[PDB]
């Protein structure tokens, strides 16, 4: 995407989202990141939405194929699950590479740095879902989430939607990846309760944003308890 203007890549990413063309969206946003400038808040969201949709479809397909493979236990189901798995790992490696070159190191503000570290934890978590260096991948996810948590607790109010989404995803990591359901439940509860106590400070629009993510925390707590 080296010959396209940064602003044109961003515009095309927005069009790709409207057209539900998420692979295109991700390629446009990768091109925008590779221009070397920092990303605005809206541009970070475009980057995250694009890759979340791409890897979300891969993960859903991997789960279908892994279930068929486990039920069967010819080489075709394993071969095809392996093909999807390799593609998924390639997308995660691409996102992690963008974060490492050089989005995180240039992110000084808490909002941007927490956003990228949450992404780093998420994409290591997706790698962990298919891994069997499994321990090192899990530790990489945990380390990224933990640094994001530490910054968010110092620099952001408890209702900040990025802080809330980070805590939600880290709790999912604890429950689904790290075999730590009690840590997952504790984190979700503490996060919910501290956000509840801070809602009084918010405008109607911010209240809507924060309460929507609190409902996701409550939905997980209901499923886990």
């Amino acid at each position: 995407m080296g010959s396209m203007e940064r602003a044109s890549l961003i515009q095309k990413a927005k069009l790709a989202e409207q057209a539900e063309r998420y692979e295109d969206m991700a390629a446009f946003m990768k091109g925008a990141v590779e221009k070397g400038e920092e990303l605005s808040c809206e541009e970070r969201n475009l980057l995250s939405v694009a890759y979340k949709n791409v890897v979300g479809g891969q993960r859903a397909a991997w789960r279908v194929l892994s279930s068929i493979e486990q039920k069967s236990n010819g080489p075709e189901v394993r071969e095809y699950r392996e093909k999807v798995e390799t593609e998924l790992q390639g997308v995660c490696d691409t996102v992690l590479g963008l974060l490492d070159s050089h989005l995180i190191k240039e992110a000084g503000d808490a909002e941007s740095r927490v956003f990228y570290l949450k992404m780093k934890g998420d994409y290591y978590r997706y790698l962990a879902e298919v891994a069997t260096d499994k321990k090192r991948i899990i530790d990489s996810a945990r380390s990224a989430y933990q640094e994001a948590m530490d910054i968010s607790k110092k620099e952001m109010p408890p209702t900040n939607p990025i802080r809330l989404g980070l805590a939600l995803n880290f709790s999912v990591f604890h429950y689904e990846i790290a075999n730590s359901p009690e840590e997952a439940i504790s984190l979700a509860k503490t996060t919910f309760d501290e956000a509840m106590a801070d809602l009084h400070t918010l405008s109607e629009d911010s209240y809507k944003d924060s309460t929507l993510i609190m409902q996701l925390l409550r939905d997980n707590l209901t499923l886990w308890t």
């Binding site: 979340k52 939905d219 997980n220």
Partner: peptide, 7 residues
């Protein structure tokens, strides 16, 4: 369970 959906 559920992570942040992402739009």
């Amino acid at each position: 369970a559920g992570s942040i959906p992402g739009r």
